[PDB]
Design an enzyme around this catalytic site. Sequence first.
Site, PDB file in Angstrom:
ATOM      1  N   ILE A  28       0.827  -1.194   0.000  1.00 56.46           N
ATOM      2  CA  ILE A  28       0.000   0.000   0.000  1.00 56.46           C
ATOM      3  C   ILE A  28       0.859   1.240   0.000  1.00 56.46           C
ATOM      4  CG2 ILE A  28      -1.296   1.552   1.492  1.00 56.46           C
ATOM      5  CD1 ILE A  28      -3.176  -0.491   2.151  1.00 56.46           C
ATOM      6  N   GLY A  29       1.697   1.346   1.019  1.00 57.99           N
ATOM      7  CA  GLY A  29       2.498   2.530   1.223  1.00 57.99           C
ATOM      8  C   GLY A  29       3.659   2.090   2.067  1.00 57.99           C
ATOM      9  N   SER A  32       7.865   6.296   7.593  1.00 57.21           N
ATOM     10  CA  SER A  32       8.096   6.462   9.026  1.00 57.21           C
ATOM     11  C   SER A  32       7.277   5.453   9.833  1.00 57.21           C
ATOM     12  CB  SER A  32       7.765   7.893   9.431  1.00 57.21           C
ATOM     13  OG  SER A  32       8.035   8.760   8.344  1.00 57.21           O
ATOM     14  N   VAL A  36       3.040  -0.944   4.874  1.00 49.34           N
ATOM     15  CA  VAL A  36       1.656  -1.367   4.977  1.00 49.34           C
ATOM     16  C   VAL A  36       1.268  -2.206   3.756  1.00 49.34           C
ATOM     17  CG1 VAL A  36      -0.718  -0.507   5.025  1.00 49.34           C
ATOM     18  CG2 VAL A  36       1.033   0.525   6.452  1.00 49.34           C
ATOM     19  N   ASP A 146      -1.576  12.534  16.055  1.00 54.96           N
ATOM     20  CA  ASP A 146      -1.342  12.668  14.631  1.00 54.96           C
ATOM     21  C   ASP A 146      -2.592  12.560  13.785  1.00 54.96           C
ATOM     22  OD1 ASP A 146      -0.107  13.256  12.352  1.00 54.96           O
ATOM     23  OD2 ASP A 146       0.911  11.308  12.040  1.00 54.96           O
TER      24      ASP A 146
END
Lengths: 348, 349
Positions: A28-29, A32, A36, A146
């Site tokens: 996915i990505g 930091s 995923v 966040d």
Amino acid sequence: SKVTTVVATPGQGPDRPQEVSYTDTKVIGNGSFGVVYQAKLCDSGELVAIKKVLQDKRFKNRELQIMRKLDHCNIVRLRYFFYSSEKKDEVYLNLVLDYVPETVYRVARHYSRAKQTLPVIYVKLYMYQLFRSLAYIHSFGICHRDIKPQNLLLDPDTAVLKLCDFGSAKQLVRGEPNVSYICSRYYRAPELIFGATDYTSSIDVWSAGCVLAELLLGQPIFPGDSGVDQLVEIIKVLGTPTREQIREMNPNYTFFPQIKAHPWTKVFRPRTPPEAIALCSRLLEYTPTARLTPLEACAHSFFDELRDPNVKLPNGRDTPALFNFTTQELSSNPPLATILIPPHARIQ
Amino acid sequence: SKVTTVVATPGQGPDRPQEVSYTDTKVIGNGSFGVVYQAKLCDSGELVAIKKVLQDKRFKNRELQIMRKLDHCNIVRLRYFFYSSGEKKDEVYLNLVLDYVPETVYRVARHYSRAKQTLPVIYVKLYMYQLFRSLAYIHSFGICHRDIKPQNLLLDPDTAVLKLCDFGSAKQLVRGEPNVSYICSRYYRAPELIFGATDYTSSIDVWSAGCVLAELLLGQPIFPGDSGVDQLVEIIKVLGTPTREQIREMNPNYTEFFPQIKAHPWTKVFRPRTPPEAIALCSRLLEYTPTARLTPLEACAHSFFDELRDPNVKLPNGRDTPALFNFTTQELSSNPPLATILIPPHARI
């Protein structure tokens, strides 16, 4: 093609290890946070995200602990975690979590690329479910630390929003101090830029404020390449904090360019709903304790339309579960129930 | 177009206002740094940049105060300033007539990045050196830029001259006095800043400079990240974890709170044909400990910059290299014996 199979512990519920097979393992990505994955659970054919991260043998994992403590319709659910093995001779922790197709970020960038903006409904819907998730994690005194558009996952068809990535959330304890260098540039609150360490869970409320603003506005409201850049944008709207207000954010500043409080109403596009700007101004307040609580904000005029029993999505579907308020969420102030739960949802 | 005639006080010199007449006011840019126009002086026909910011009387303009003290080949010159009433009604603007320079290190580095090319080390060498002179100079006055980043390093592509600019964040740093921890652009912040320390020193600039170095080699930012955490990771990935001293030496009271990542070797970070020299310099600026970092002057004297102290070094375009050696005492104040290295055998005769 290739099918993988692990023994994993279920997320909430008691260590009863389960066989879990899955396949179709697209990335996915990554960054930091960790890395995923998308993945398809063999059994159900359901799609899940898997967040592989490095695990220090020294400590227990902070996100993991939190995540297992958490069960809520607007927060991605951990389903299984489990350990495994890029970096040889060391151990990975894998969170298997709900997967969601779009993210508020993607979505609002789509609308912005197209010089248009988000049907206000779609905002309310999102903003509200977000405040629910905040209201709920905050009741464990947990703080996301966040909230950004990128960390709010959307189901485009059902309009369900789910808060995600707790790789950063911490349970704030009174009189304990926490790192000020968290939270994503734009959504950092005053006190954080003023490097405070005794901040409370209300920083989440400020971030959400900027998320609302950004959706109403086409663009981030408090952009800045540096802390100063941001403060100026914040000032240019709120006005110069006062000595009083500054003691509130961070005392050790009791070092300031004197500007007048710009009327909010002139910050937003012209046909921006008044109730929405009202909301914003009550979220983005210099004084951390003056800002609405997530729950107070849920129970506000801007969300009034969500309580209308006729309310439907544009695709004519039903709005997601909006009023099923566990006693837990309501905990921070239960009299608010009367408003949060509209007559028609107390019907037999 | 229109001509404009203000009466303006010279940047340095005495304090004697005079008529200044300029024209052709295109608008370079504008953000927090107020607006920045460009314009052609009627007298010299020369090009300048006007930086117009809002001014309170509630204080002397810190930037102005500093600018008037500053004469260096590698720092934009304040030529005049003057006041006016512009966009805000009954509101007072200070204008800063400054050297205009056609390019910025940001702009250039991007071209190269887009192109997938990498800026010729000769240029990394020239730019970096000149940067380091300009710091050496300003820090000798204990002034600190506090916003070193490629956007704020102007260039004349042609003459090869770099000039440091934008001083709205510059502040003279007095010992035992505290300063705001929220200066510096995202990617170029020294760790102690990310820890909100307010006991920091000019070194914050050397970190920001080593960042610019790294970028010009790497071809992209070295410590990217949208949050202080994301950057702190990025950094730890490269410098390893801080010891407890290293930590107590930035911000003292972050003694508690960290992943124990080993240091991924400096070499291991850069394209393989990167000059050892370059990396060595890098490792010496990007130190956790503020005190352990090279000084600007210390850095100009580094072996990396040797190519420039050669006598038949010349620019790619065929021109010769700009004033590299016009050191003044002042500039060398921090450590004079460096002069025998900084100033080569052939220079200045």
